[PDB]
Design a protein around this ligand. Sequence first.
Ligand SMILES: [Cl-]
Ligand SMILES: [Mg+2]
Lengths: 294, 292
Amino acid sequence: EPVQVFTDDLGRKVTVPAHPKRIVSLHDLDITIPLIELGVPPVASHGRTRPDGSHFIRSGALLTGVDFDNSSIAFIGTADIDIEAIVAAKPDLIITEPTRNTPIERLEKIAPTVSIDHLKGGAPEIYRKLAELTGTQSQLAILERRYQAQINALKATLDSQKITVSVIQANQGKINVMHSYHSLGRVLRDAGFRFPPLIESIPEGGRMDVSAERLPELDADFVFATWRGDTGGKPQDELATMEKVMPGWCQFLTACRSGRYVLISREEAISNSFASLGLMAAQIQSQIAGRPLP
Amino acid sequence: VQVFTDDLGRKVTVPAHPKRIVSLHDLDITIPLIELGVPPVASHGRTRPDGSHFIRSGALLTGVDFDNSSIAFIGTADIDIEAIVAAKPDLIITEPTRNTPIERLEKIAPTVSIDHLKGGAPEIYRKLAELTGTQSQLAILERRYQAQINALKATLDSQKITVSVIQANQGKINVMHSYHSLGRVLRDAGFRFPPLIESIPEGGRMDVSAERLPELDADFVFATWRGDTGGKPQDELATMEKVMPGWCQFLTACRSGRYVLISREEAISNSFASLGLMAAQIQSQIAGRPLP
Ligand SMILES: [Cl-]
Ligand SMILES: [Mg+2]
């Protein structure tokens, strides 16, 4: 079996298959979804657990169509990982990350184990690392080409470099803003939309809370926000929460007053996935260029 | 059982697991094959006046085109038989709008004809999955679509909201029983449509007089704009104004800022990719755009 040395984010030099056939993933969102997108789904995965004891891969069905109930992917735990289940899956590669609590020393006894950290370079680096680790560089190239096509289509729709945007979130009586809000921020920046200085000046990978009084500093041509829908929530929830931040908040933003405040489903907006990038690009396109107002 | 009856009624013996498929149509066959995980070794595509070739919607919807793959281009109008032979296919898939005599293809490899006019996209994918042994991948694609519809249904009471899809067609308005991807998602999500649309037979369409715009009004009115040739949404608005000056005032949806323009290339696709794009846009356009 052909083999490679991979340097993980703990600086460990790990001899791994050139083409792993049985991967165990210790995080649904951070690892399993990217693996599925790369065409190398794990044989076992971390996931979430509901109070009735049912299990699911977070965003699995929604973004990839893959979940525990329609696949041969074994569930290995949510909090404490079932070591017996990992062993039973007979992995040739185990992928974990720094926020997991299963000891590396235990995992490495089972199979070549690597730890990957999204704090080093974000989603693009995670996919680059996973593609190298799994020999799926050709599939990554296809994913990247489609993303290029999506950005180019968006850029061709409108003069993005002359349109300002912002992404905001209610946070316990204040406004939280990121330099780049996950998938949504990534697409906006890649398409060349410009952000207000308060947001642009936040260090890369950073974020800040902003006082309600300063809302006008977050104003732009279009203002985006997200709402949580994975547990029965609705867009009106973020509206109600913004009201708790400041009654009449709408009047502090020319974007909201003019009907250019846009609410996006959070679960897809926060994912690292190529699926998410496409969903963002489409929504940005029609919300900005495809919604004429009287 | 390696036996596939095609849409011409031909009983064709095929490979159990075809490895080298030749596709005679980019949109109707190549895109679905790529989505099913069995991209062809050669494909029909389009040709620009400078001689460059592309798989229509290939890069945009799948990330796959001639210029970043080993897929051979085999022609736009006339099919290059020599190129097909050189591709060493084990299966050739064609469709009834093509002009290549089936007998020429049959001499090369097992050849099957699939017709999107019988059942549309759902039937195309079912047939291609059976033909290529990709029933498992199709189930995955179908599961994602179900999740997307359920997400949309959970966002709002779609059964209380009416929607309408319209298209400018040479001075009149064309409406379909179901506008490809866009219409499929709207119907599947449980939205209601204007009385006129429900009267159109399945797979059918009709032109209506510009004067009858009010009968096509709904809570939200959707239309599409062509962008694959440098077009922009404003170009579609210009077209409507020529159909009917002040057309906006004849629709309560347009007057009140509930007229939505969607990119046509994605909207008319048979793809699962497009269904997801439609669902996301419907969701935020209807439920995520509060107006003053
Ligand atoms: Cl141990
Ligand atoms: Mg400003």
